[PDB]
Amino acid sequence: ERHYSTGQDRHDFYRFAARLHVDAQCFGLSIDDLMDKFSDKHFRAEHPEYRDVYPEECSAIYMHTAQDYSSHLVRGEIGTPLYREVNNYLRLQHENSGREAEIDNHDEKLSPHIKMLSSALNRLMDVAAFRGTVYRGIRGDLDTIARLYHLFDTGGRYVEPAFMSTTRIKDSAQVFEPGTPNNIAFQISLKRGADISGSSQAPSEEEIMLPMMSEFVIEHASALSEGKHLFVLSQI
């Protein structure tokens, strides 16, 4: 059970996305604008990994990496950004295993996107899986820090129910050099992940994205400057 989109799914997604609000205070792209840039005959010519990836899938990746869409409106502006509502939903959800065996048992509102994004990553990992080292920067509590050292100390897996987002570029995690904002760094070596830089709103961020329910062994855990901590992760 790895999920791949169907024709009906791709219609669902279009209608789902068509209802999203775009941030007017920016140069926003609607689903039609996206369906267009991602169906553009030159796109798959410049990015052949996308040869057998649908525009609806490119759009799902794009919309997830962006800060401009929300399901809701708050007075003037867009509500909470799509990726956050979705990620948060996946982390809180207590009705599924959270795995791809059960992607058709999620909330009717968000599932068209959850499914589309999953399919996108699957299509891409199929042709061009990424293996290697990527990085994550987090900002957190002593409580958060303590949990990780705890997981490490007791051999518990680090498990992320949502779509993990990571970067190939150490600098981009914004953790390692003082005096950057993030105080928790993750150095992750992946056996398998999705290079979505082609569809990302910010390709220069050079991101690799993981499917729902990615699982890691914490190999090492140590201090850095400050204040700062480094956990070395290994994908299962």
Short mmCIF file of C-alpha atoms in Angstrom, two decimals:
data_model
loop_
_atom_site.label_atom_id
_atom_site.label_comp_id
_atom_site.label_asym_id
_atom_site.label_seq_id
_atom_site.Cartn_x
_atom_site.Cartn_y
_atom_site.Cartn_z
CA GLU A 1 0.00 0.00 0.00
CA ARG A 2 1.61 3.12 -1.38
CA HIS A 3 -0.96 5.68 -2.45
CA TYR A 4 -1.16 6.92 -6.06
CA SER A 5 -3.78 9.41 -7.21
CA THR A 6 -6.67 8.48 -9.47
CA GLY A 7 -8.62 10.65 -11.87
CA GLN A 8 -11.35 11.21 -9.29
CA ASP A 9 -8.75 12.23 -6.70
CA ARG A 10 -7.27 14.79 -9.07
CA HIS A 11 -10.72 16.30 -9.58
CA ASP A 12 -11.34 16.34 -5.84
CA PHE A 13 -8.06 18.20 -5.38
CA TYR A 14 -8.82 20.83 -7.99
CA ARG A 15 -12.15 21.61 -6.30
CA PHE A 16 -10.49 21.55 -2.89
CA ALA A 17 -7.78 23.92 -3.97
CA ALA A 18 -10.18 26.19 -5.79
CA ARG A 19 -11.78 27.06 -2.48
CA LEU A 20 -8.54 28.06 -0.74
CA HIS A 21 -7.97 31.71 -0.01
CA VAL A 22 -4.87 33.29 -1.46
CA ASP A 23 -3.04 36.03 0.43
CA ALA A 24 -3.92 39.23 -1.39
CA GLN A 25 -0.97 41.11 0.18
CA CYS A 26 1.30 39.08 -2.07
CA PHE A 27 1.50 38.07 -5.73
CA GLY A 28 -0.72 35.04 -5.24
CA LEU A 29 -1.25 32.11 -7.58
CA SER A 30 -4.64 30.42 -7.78
CA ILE A 31 -5.15 26.78 -8.55
CA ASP A 32 -5.84 27.81 -12.15
CA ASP A 33 -2.59 29.77 -12.26
CA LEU A 34 -0.85 26.70 -10.83
CA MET A 35 -2.63 24.20 -13.07
CA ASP A 36 -1.25 26.32 -15.82
CA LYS A 37 2.37 26.72 -14.80
CA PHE A 38 2.51 23.01 -13.96
CA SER A 39 0.88 21.78 -17.18
CA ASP A 40 3.09 24.07 -19.23
CA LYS A 41 4.79 21.89 -21.82
CA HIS A 42 8.21 23.42 -20.93
CA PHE A 43 7.94 22.33 -17.30
CA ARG A 44 8.50 18.62 -17.82
CA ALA A 45 11.11 19.47 -20.45
CA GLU A 46 13.17 21.39 -17.85
CA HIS A 47 12.35 18.95 -15.08
CA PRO A 48 12.01 15.47 -16.55
CA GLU A 49 11.51 13.86 -13.07
CA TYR A 50 8.00 15.27 -13.42
CA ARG A 51 7.40 13.38 -16.67
CA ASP A 52 4.75 11.19 -15.09
CA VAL A 53 3.71 13.55 -12.32
CA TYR A 54 0.39 15.36 -12.64
CA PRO A 55 -0.15 19.15 -12.41
CA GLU A 56 -2.49 18.54 -9.49
CA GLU A 57 0.47 16.92 -7.72
CA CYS A 58 2.91 19.70 -8.50
CA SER A 59 0.27 22.13 -7.21
CA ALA A 60 -0.19 20.18 -3.99
CA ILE A 61 3.56 20.33 -3.35
CA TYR A 62 3.68 24.02 -4.25
CA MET A 63 0.68 24.92 -2.07
CA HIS A 64 2.12 22.95 0.84
CA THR A 65 5.50 24.76 0.68
CA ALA A 66 3.86 28.17 0.50
CA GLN A 67 2.73 30.61 3.13
CA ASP A 68 -0.11 32.14 1.08
CA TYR A 69 -3.04 29.73 1.28
CA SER A 70 -5.51 29.04 4.05
CA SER A 71 -8.80 27.17 4.26
CA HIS A 72 -10.10 30.18 6.18
CA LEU A 73 -10.30 33.94 6.21
CA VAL A 74 -9.72 36.02 9.35
CA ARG A 75 -11.20 39.46 8.81
CA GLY A 76 -9.04 40.86 6.09
CA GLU A 77 -6.43 38.19 5.75
CA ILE A 78 -5.93 34.49 5.15
CA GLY A 79 -6.18 32.27 8.21
CA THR A 80 -3.68 29.67 9.37
CA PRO A 81 -1.52 28.51 6.40
CA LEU A 82 -2.52 25.26 4.70
CA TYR A 83 0.63 23.28 5.55
CA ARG A 84 0.22 24.05 9.21
CA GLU A 85 -3.46 23.14 9.41
CA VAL A 86 -2.70 19.88 7.59
CA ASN A 87 0.46 18.98 9.50
CA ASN A 88 -1.25 19.77 12.78
CA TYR A 89 -4.28 17.71 11.75
CA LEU A 90 -2.11 14.70 10.92
CA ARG A 91 -0.21 14.96 14.24
CA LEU A 92 -3.42 15.21 16.32
CA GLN A 93 -5.54 12.75 14.39
CA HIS A 94 -6.61 9.70 16.45
CA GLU A 95 -8.77 7.59 14.08
CA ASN A 96 -6.20 6.05 11.68
CA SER A 97 -2.82 4.38 11.94
CA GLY A 98 -1.80 7.60 10.21
CA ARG A 99 -0.22 5.39 7.55
CA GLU A 100 -0.86 5.19 3.76
CA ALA A 101 -2.80 1.96 4.24
CA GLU A 102 -5.55 4.18 5.68
CA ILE A 103 -5.37 7.52 3.75
CA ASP A 104 -9.03 7.22 2.73
CA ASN A 105 -10.18 7.45 6.35
CA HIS A 106 -9.20 11.08 6.96
CA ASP A 107 -11.31 14.27 7.39
CA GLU A 108 -13.26 15.00 4.18
CA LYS A 109 -12.05 18.59 4.26
CA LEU A 110 -8.30 18.04 4.05
CA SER A 111 -7.96 14.55 2.56
CA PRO A 112 -8.06 15.66 -1.06
CA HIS A 113 -4.78 17.47 -0.32
CA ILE A 114 -3.27 14.88 1.98
CA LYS A 115 -3.81 12.28 -0.69
CA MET A 116 -2.57 14.44 -3.53
CA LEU A 117 0.65 15.32 -1.67
CA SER A 118 1.25 11.70 -0.75
CA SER A 119 0.81 10.68 -4.38
CA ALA A 120 3.15 13.45 -5.50
CA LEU A 121 5.93 12.29 -3.23
CA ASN A 122 5.34 8.69 -4.31
CA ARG A 123 5.52 9.52 -8.06
CA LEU A 124 8.75 11.45 -7.42
CA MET A 125 10.44 8.97 -5.11
CA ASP A 126 9.62 6.35 -7.78
CA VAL A 127 11.78 8.03 -10.38
CA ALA A 128 14.30 10.00 -8.35
CA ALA A 129 14.38 8.99 -4.70
CA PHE A 130 16.86 10.88 -2.55
CA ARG A 131 19.29 9.22 -0.22
CA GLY A 132 21.83 11.16 1.80
CA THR A 133 22.13 13.81 4.48
CA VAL A 134 19.61 16.59 5.00
CA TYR A 135 19.07 19.02 7.86
CA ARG A 136 16.24 20.46 9.99
CA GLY A 137 16.23 23.41 12.32
CA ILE A 138 13.75 23.61 15.18
CA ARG A 139 13.25 26.18 17.98
CA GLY A 140 12.24 24.65 21.32
CA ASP A 141 11.91 24.43 25.12
CA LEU A 142 14.05 22.71 27.67
CA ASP A 143 11.02 20.42 27.83
CA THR A 144 11.28 19.69 24.09
CA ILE A 145 15.07 19.28 24.36
CA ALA A 146 14.67 16.92 27.33
CA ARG A 147 12.25 14.74 25.38
CA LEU A 148 14.72 14.20 22.57
CA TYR A 149 17.59 13.34 24.89
CA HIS A 150 15.13 11.03 26.57
CA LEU A 151 14.13 9.32 23.32
CA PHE A 152 17.82 8.94 22.56
CA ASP A 153 18.71 7.58 26.00
CA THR A 154 15.99 4.93 25.84
CA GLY A 155 16.18 4.00 22.17
CA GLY A 156 12.73 5.31 21.33
CA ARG A 157 12.10 6.19 17.71
CA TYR A 158 11.53 9.73 16.61
CA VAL A 159 8.29 9.54 14.65
CA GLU A 160 6.77 12.37 12.62
CA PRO A 161 3.09 11.83 11.67
CA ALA A 162 3.06 14.83 9.34
CA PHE A 163 5.08 15.52 6.17
CA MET A 164 8.64 16.21 7.34
CA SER A 165 10.40 19.02 5.56
CA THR A 166 14.16 19.12 5.42
CA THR A 167 16.95 20.89 3.55
CA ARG A 168 20.14 19.73 1.85
CA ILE A 169 21.87 22.97 2.83
CA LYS A 170 23.23 23.18 6.38
CA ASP A 171 22.92 26.96 6.38
CA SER A 172 19.22 26.80 5.55
CA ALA A 173 18.31 24.95 8.74
CA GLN A 174 19.46 28.12 10.50
CA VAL A 175 20.73 26.35 13.62
CA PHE A 176 24.41 25.65 13.38
CA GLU A 177 26.07 29.03 13.42
CA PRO A 178 25.54 31.26 16.35
CA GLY A 179 23.59 33.26 16.66
CA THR A 180 20.80 31.82 14.58
CA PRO A 181 17.12 31.51 15.69
CA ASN A 182 16.84 27.70 15.91
CA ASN A 183 18.44 25.96 18.90
CA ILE A 184 17.67 22.35 17.95
CA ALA A 185 19.41 20.91 14.89
CA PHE A 186 18.60 17.61 13.23
CA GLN A 187 21.15 15.91 11.06
CA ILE A 188 19.21 13.29 9.19
CA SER A 189 20.47 10.65 6.84
CA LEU A 190 17.72 9.36 4.59
CA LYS A 191 17.41 6.10 2.79
CA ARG A 192 14.45 7.47 0.84
CA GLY A 193 12.88 10.91 0.38
CA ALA A 194 11.34 13.28 -2.12
CA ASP A 195 13.20 16.07 -3.84
CA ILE A 196 10.40 18.54 -4.47
CA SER A 197 12.62 21.53 -5.21
CA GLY A 198 11.13 21.57 -8.72
CA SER A 199 7.59 22.15 -7.46
CA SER A 200 8.48 24.12 -4.35
CA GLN A 201 7.52 27.79 -4.07
CA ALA A 202 11.11 28.23 -2.96
CA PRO A 203 13.34 25.82 -4.97
CA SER A 204 16.46 27.61 -3.60
CA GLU A 205 15.50 26.19 -0.19
CA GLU A 206 16.58 22.87 -1.80
CA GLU A 207 14.12 20.81 0.23
CA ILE A 208 13.57 17.07 0.58
CA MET A 209 10.10 16.07 1.93
CA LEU A 210 9.17 12.77 3.64
CA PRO A 211 5.90 10.81 3.42
CA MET A 212 3.52 10.76 6.43
CA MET A 213 4.67 8.66 9.42
CA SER A 214 8.41 8.83 8.80
CA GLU A 215 10.36 7.04 11.50
CA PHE A 216 13.91 7.65 12.84
CA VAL A 217 16.53 6.19 15.15
CA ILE A 218 18.43 8.85 17.05
CA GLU A 219 22.05 7.71 16.63
CA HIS A 220 23.79 10.57 18.53
CA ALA A 221 22.77 13.57 20.64
CA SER A 222 25.07 16.27 21.86
CA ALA A 223 25.49 19.90 22.67
CA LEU A 224 26.85 22.64 20.51
CA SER A 225 27.27 26.27 21.38
CA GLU A 226 24.77 28.00 23.68
CA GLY A 227 22.12 26.63 24.18
CA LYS A 228 22.12 24.53 21.03
CA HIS A 229 21.74 20.81 20.52
CA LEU A 230 22.36 18.42 17.70
CA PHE A 231 20.51 15.17 17.19
CA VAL A 232 21.74 12.81 14.54
CA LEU A 233 18.85 10.93 12.99
CA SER A 234 18.72 7.81 10.83
CA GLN A 235 15.71 6.94 8.66
CA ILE A 236 14.09 3.53 9.01
#
